Amino acid sequence: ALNWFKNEFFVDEWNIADVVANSENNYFTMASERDVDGTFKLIELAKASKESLKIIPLGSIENLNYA
Amino acid sequence: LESKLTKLSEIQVNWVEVQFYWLDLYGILGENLDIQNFLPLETSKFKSLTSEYKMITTRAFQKLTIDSLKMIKSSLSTFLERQRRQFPRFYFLGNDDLLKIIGSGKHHDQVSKFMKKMFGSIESIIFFEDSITGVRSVEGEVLNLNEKIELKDSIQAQEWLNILDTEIKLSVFTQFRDCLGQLKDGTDIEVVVSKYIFQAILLSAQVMWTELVEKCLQTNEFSKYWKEVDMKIKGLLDKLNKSSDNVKKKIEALLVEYLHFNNVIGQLKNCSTKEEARLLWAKVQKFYQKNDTLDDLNSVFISQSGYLLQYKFEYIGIPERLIYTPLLLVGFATLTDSLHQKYGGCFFGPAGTGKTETVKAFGQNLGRVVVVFNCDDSFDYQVLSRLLVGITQIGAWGCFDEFNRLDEKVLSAVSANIQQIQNGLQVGKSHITLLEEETPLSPHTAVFITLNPGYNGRSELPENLKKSFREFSMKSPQSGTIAEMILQIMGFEDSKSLASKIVHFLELLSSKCSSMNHYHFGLRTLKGVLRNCSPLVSEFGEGEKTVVESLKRVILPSLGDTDELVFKDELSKIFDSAGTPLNSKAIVQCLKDAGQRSGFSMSEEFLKKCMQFYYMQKTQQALILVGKAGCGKTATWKTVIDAMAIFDGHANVVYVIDTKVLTKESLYGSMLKATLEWRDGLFTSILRRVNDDITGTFKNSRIWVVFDSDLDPEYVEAMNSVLDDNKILTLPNGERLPIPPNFRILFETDNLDHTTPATITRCGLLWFSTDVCSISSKIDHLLNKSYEALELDKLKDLISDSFDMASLTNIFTCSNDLVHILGVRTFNKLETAVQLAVHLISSYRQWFQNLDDKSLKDVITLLIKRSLLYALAGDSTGESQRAFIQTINTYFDSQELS
Amino acid sequence: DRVVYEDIPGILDTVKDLWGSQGVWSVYCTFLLSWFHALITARTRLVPHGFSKKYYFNDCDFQFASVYLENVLATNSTNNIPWAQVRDHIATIVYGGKIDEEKDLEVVAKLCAHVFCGSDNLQIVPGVRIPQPLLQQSEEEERARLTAILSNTIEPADSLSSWLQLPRESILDYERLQAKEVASSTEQLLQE
Ligand SMILES: Nc1ncnc2c1ncn2[C@@H]1O[C@H](COP(=O)(O)OP(=O)(O)OP(=O)(O)O)[C@@H](O)[C@H]1O
Ligand SMILES: Nc1ncnc2c1ncn2[C@@H]1O[C@H](COP(=O)(O)OP(=O)(O)O)[C@@H](O)[C@H]1O
Ligand SMILES: [Mg+2]
């Protein structure tokens, strides 16, 4: 009964691939709670779109300069 | 001329240091050829320094040089980094040791002292008329190389070090091959165990065991091989009691392995069908061997649950083998699962459960020593990444112990480096780029982390880093199997019942005692009990008496008031009898002599505490002394140190360090971020000074380091690799300073509220439930000390007679009810009273030659009353002081004090 | 642009996602593995009853279980698949490594025994029945058959209770609390 509204009124849903492919913005911000990550989703999306990801974590000055 | 002698000694020490630095400079640039052309400006500076040193030497024969050498030491950093890149194992050495090893143009003897640092399980090198015959292990085992290697006079260190590194692997493989051939010929292992090194015998025995077990699995019979392995175990146990120390260690390790073999065969015999038998055989570790390999060193591979790992054939010596619990086997299985895709094996759980030792046992089963690092907040991104590029070039396995202690920013920053290392290992990349410097990647490298989650002052691993590791939980270890197998190794008659009683008694003590913050009775205390029971077999034998004595000496000193009564009741209930205690006449006499020379009085409780401390430290290396403030910890350990010096004759040096006074950068050290050199701290400086042994007396002297402050966790778990059985101090710069057996650490504190279980279990704790000295004895000792700090005998006698026990105790009990600001117990304030009264009497003695006895006694009593007032009620208001002077007037012919 | 990443709530949706992300026995084993991963991730949400605490199973566990399955299928090619060995390794090493307690190990072993039982008339859920593959089929035909039998499955309203084999009291309590929270929040939001 909770998701009946979503099932009946709305007849379309957007995933990460659609929101990446259907946005004018060149910058995307991704969020999740602790002890879970979606880096593999972005890696899979980049592989499917035939692009290259430069994974650069932050936290140190040398890595900031490289960034 | 004491000042002149001290100045001469300081000048001699400075000249010796300058001579050593100049010798290193001559070895690196002044002696070797084709080496000054690398850096021309540095060559010119070295030539100028050589000219200045020659002029100074001529002037001395008939500070500025040391300063110039220190200044040009910065210009040698690039050359040192290139030298480290030449031989990858030099990454475990500092700049000073690198200069020492590269300046050995023809002596070739300073290399041998560093083998423990570079290799891990090799102590010295055997030399024979300028030719290396073999390498010597730490545990005393002697390895003979396959062929002698001739040394050239103009050869460089790194080339012959590399050929020695390969020769060690070749020799170990040769010994394994002919040992395996001899066991295939049908001989027994009893004659082989006195002929070859331990590693070859172990590997050949494992290969033979898995081949015979697979042959038996081709049928459905298991009884004959089980009986044969049982007879072999009994024969090895018989041979254990009649062999030398090296053979004793080797036989003990082979007996551990054969006990594991018998356990696996017995588990396979109890199967009902063949499917579960095959599953159980696939779950355990197997040691197969290639039959058509043209390369010698890759002919042995390890199979477990369908995954294959390569044997490295690196020398490990005779390490302390571990008992193969089922949890250890499952940990080996998940480590092989993680390493099949070149990930990092990760172990998480409470402290004292066997994580780092499980990783080390896995490495030893894979035939390579595992270098262990102790992470800390000071391990920033550059240092940790330098350690990673150090361990990738060597190919040695890095086990980052206490991975939670890292700062979170470093934890997130090193994720890219760890992912790059994993991807290079998986894709077979020849080179990787870390720190903007392309470095080789040995295919044998791997990383492990062992973190202890859910602690105070510990960071949390981000998920993008946890996805590169594989967490495995070891919350519950198997103490029963470890205790049973170790007690069977030691030679106890009834191992099973005794081990079950030990484990049940430990759990009963854990579950039926007052739950205070330091009553931790897991696996470390059981291992300590067994290690303390090992020396007791000489004078107590293998039986119940040794076990109860070891349990007393290990557990009892860390108990309170009711807890020790509970422990005694449980010891009487669960064990058949309590043995007669040790005679201990010599140590008691030495302790009493030390106390007499130190002014203390030997009561029952203080002597009991001293004896407990002595018997605890006899096996345990690092101790924590816990008690109330002003309880007698310093007096206890100082008296025991003096007693040891009297009894054994070994000189004692004490290096008292206050932990919280100094910052960490001044305690352990700090990487100078300006141009990346290591500046020694204080504890590190002490450790390096005692390791190098310039004076030559530390070989026959004990060294005691006292951390006389609170146990701040940020200061204490920087030493987790020192407190445990690793006995190394893993510096940020890769320096692996070993802990000598005569290097003991004492912790002097008052509370354990903010400490962590990671350091309580590592040290034998000593608890002071109440004060060790009575009031009157303390007053008498303080009076004796004040008299020693200075007719006189009559004055001292009457002063001591004026301190009547009944009146003084009544005054001290009456002083407790007053309201005190800055609350101090009246036990602590007696020093002020004694010193003030003694000083007042000493000040007024100048007019005591012309006074009557009654007047003199009344004056001295008045001064004593005033001192007692101002040292007991000195921190109280006017009304309280008036009440107390009235009380002391009532409680003492004495002159009235208003 | 902002995107919030969360695990897919539906069990059938999770199976479809893991199937779209990816010998015929390898396809059968990875299908059973996707079902097992979806079931255990669905059971992870129920903290008081599904497990003892909050766990986190991600794609790495699925990848390792898939690699172990393909390694066992490749090496043990004599068509006598060691289902007990696969069950023990998956429930102890791969998916049971992160497990700290013992009851959670027991329930993971029970779930793996129900999923990887290795019987021809396998019934993982009361609706869907998966026959074992025959020896005369192609890989593309196998994938088409498994996709077709996945498409015809309909998710009942009590999938959080009936599919996971749990008593309805805990699921009713959890769904009631969640519905109460969301309904109270939307009642507060609707007024103004
Ligand atoms: N057996 C003893 N006989 C005589 N004096 C004693 C005895 N035991 C302790 N004392 C006295 O107790 C006083 C306080 O003890 P001590 O100096 O050992 O404290 P501590 O353990 O260093 O305390 P803290 O570090 O908390 O300040 C000392 O002046 C010492 O002389
Ligand atoms: N067979 C064994 N299995 C597990 N642990 C053992 C065994 N034998 C001895 N131990 C003890 O286990 C301890 C392992 O310490 P560990 O808990 O790994 O430290 P850390 O938590 O810092 O990694 C060692 O101090 C050792 O005394
Ligand atoms: Mg450790």
Short mmCIF file of C-alpha atoms and ligand atoms in Angstrom, two decimals, chain B residues 320-325 328 349-358 401-402 450 452 477 482 486 523-524 527-528 720 724-725 758 762, ligand 2:
data_model
loop_
_atom_site.label_atom_id
_atom_site.label_comp_id
_atom_site.label_asym_id
_atom_site.label_seq_id
_atom_site.Cartn_x
_atom_site.Cartn_y
_atom_site.Cartn_z
CA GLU B 320 57.52 -20.72 17.17
CA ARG B 321 54.99 -22.90 15.37
CA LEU B 322 51.30 -22.46 16.11
CA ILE B 323 48.70 -25.05 17.07
CA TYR B 324 46.38 -25.76 14.13
CA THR B 325 42.96 -24.90 15.51
CA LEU B 328 43.21 -21.13 12.13
CA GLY B 349 38.01 -8.93 16.03
CA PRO B 350 38.90 -8.35 19.67
CA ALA B 351 42.50 -8.20 20.82
CA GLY B 352 44.33 -11.35 21.86
CA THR B 353 42.63 -13.73 19.42
CA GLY B 354 45.50 -14.69 17.12
CA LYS B 355 45.36 -12.44 14.04
CA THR B 356 48.94 -11.28 13.45
CA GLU B 357 50.25 -14.69 14.48
CA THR B 358 47.78 -16.36 12.11
CA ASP B 401 49.06 -4.56 12.30
CA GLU B 402 46.57 -2.23 14.03
CA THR B 450 44.59 -6.73 11.10
CA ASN B 452 40.56 -4.13 16.09
CA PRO B 477 39.41 -18.74 19.43
CA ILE B 482 45.97 -24.93 21.98
CA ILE B 486 51.11 -27.32 23.98
CA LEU B 523 44.09 -16.37 25.12
CA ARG B 524 47.13 -14.20 25.90
CA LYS B 527 49.81 -18.48 26.55
CA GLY B 528 51.60 -16.63 29.34
CA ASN B 720 52.07 -2.90 20.06
CA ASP B 724 53.95 -8.59 22.08
CA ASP B 725 56.21 -11.45 20.97
CA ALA B 758 45.08 -4.05 23.29
CA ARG B 762 50.17 -7.69 26.41
N1 LIG D 2 48.21 -21.48 18.08
C1 LIG D 2 47.85 -20.20 18.35
N2 LIG D 2 46.75 -19.66 17.79
C2 LIG D 2 46.39 -18.39 18.04
N3 LIG D 2 47.08 -17.57 18.86
C3 LIG D 2 48.20 -17.99 19.49
C4 LIG D 2 48.66 -19.36 19.26
N4 LIG D 2 49.78 -19.53 19.98
C5 LIG D 2 50.02 -18.36 20.62
N5 LIG D 2 49.08 -17.44 20.32
C6 LIG D 2 49.05 -16.05 20.87
O1 LIG D 2 48.17 -15.21 20.12
C7 LIG D 2 48.68 -13.88 20.13
C8 LIG D 2 48.35 -13.19 18.82
O2 LIG D 2 48.24 -11.78 19.01
P1 LIG D 2 47.16 -10.96 18.16
O3 LIG D 2 45.84 -11.01 18.89
O4 LIG D 2 47.24 -11.44 16.73
O5 LIG D 2 47.73 -9.46 18.22
P2 LIG D 2 47.01 -8.27 17.41
O6 LIG D 2 45.59 -8.29 17.93
O7 LIG D 2 47.80 -7.04 17.80
O8 LIG D 2 47.16 -8.66 15.97
C9 LIG D 2 50.17 -13.98 20.38
O9 LIG D 2 50.55 -13.08 21.42
C10 LIG D 2 50.42 -15.41 20.83
O10 LIG D 2 51.00 -15.43 22.13
#
